[PDB]
Each structure stands twice: as structure tokens, then as C-alpha cells.
């Protein structure tokens, strides 16, 4: 019953709508929900030179890429939450349903 749905996404409002959708689906299917626990955002940071040559003033580019991680833990037999999580998928987020 104790099953772990984690959502890893680069875009935030996408992830938030998926987090909302799984709470909606859970409270409708009448099963105990642990709310969307927000793990710290990881900021992948790469900083390079701008110029292809080396005949300019030393200006650097600061490239960032945030990656967000939510998880909701439910008390439900595999099936009903599997069919809840088989609907309403968008390209931004990525799903993991963990049983044990």
C-alpha cells in the first residue's frame, strides 16, 4: 500500500499541475495522501568564455539549468493509482512509481 510517486521536471508550473492532478486523483479515489514533499532544487551551472579566439576582453557566459524533484507517498493497492498515473501526461515532467 505504502507506494512512492516521485516527479522530476526542469519546468516548475508543469510539475505543480502534475502534483495537483495526483492529489485530485488520490482524494477522489478515497486513499491516504502524503502531500508533495519538495526536495531542494539542483542548479547545474556551467561557465565558459564567450569568444572562440582569445583576442577580446575576458567576458564569461553563466549558463544555469534548474532541476526540481517532488514526491507524494500514498496508501493504495498498485492498480487504482497505476490507472490514475496512466492519464494526463505532458512532455516536461518525468514519472517514477516505487512500490517498496
Amino acid at each position: 500500500h505504502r507506494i512512492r510517486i516521485t516527479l522530476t521536471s526542469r519546468n516548475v508550473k508543469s510539475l505543480e499541475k502534475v502534483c495537483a492532478d495526483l492529489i485530485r486523483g488520490a482524494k477522489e479515489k478515497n486513499l491516504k495522501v502524503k502531500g508533495p514533499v519538495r526536495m531542494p532544487t539542483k542548479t547545474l551551472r556551467i561557465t565558459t568564455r564567450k569568444t572562440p579566439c582569445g583576442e577580446g576582453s575576458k567576458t564569461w557566459d553563466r549558463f544555469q539549468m534548474r532541476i526540481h524533484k517532488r514526491l507524494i507517498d500514498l496508501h493504495s493497492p498498485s492498480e487504482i493509482v497505476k490507472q490514475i498515473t496512466s492519464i494526463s501526461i505532458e512532455p516536461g515532467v518525468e514519472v517514477e512509481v516505487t512500490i517498496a
Binding site: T8, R10, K42, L44, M65, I67, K69
Partner: peptide
């Protein structure tokens, strides 16, 4: 997936894939 790589490397892998 037993290769079980980091979410950091997973997303830059998906980044170069589309690129």
C-alpha cells in the same frame, strides 16, 4: 534501470539527445 545514473547526468543526456 540497474545502470542507475544521476538525475543531473540523465537530464544533460536527454538534452544532447534532442540536440
Amino acid at each position: 534501470m540497474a545502470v542507475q545514473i544521476s538525475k543531473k547526468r540523465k537530464f544533460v543526456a536527454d538534452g544532447i539527445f534532442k540536440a
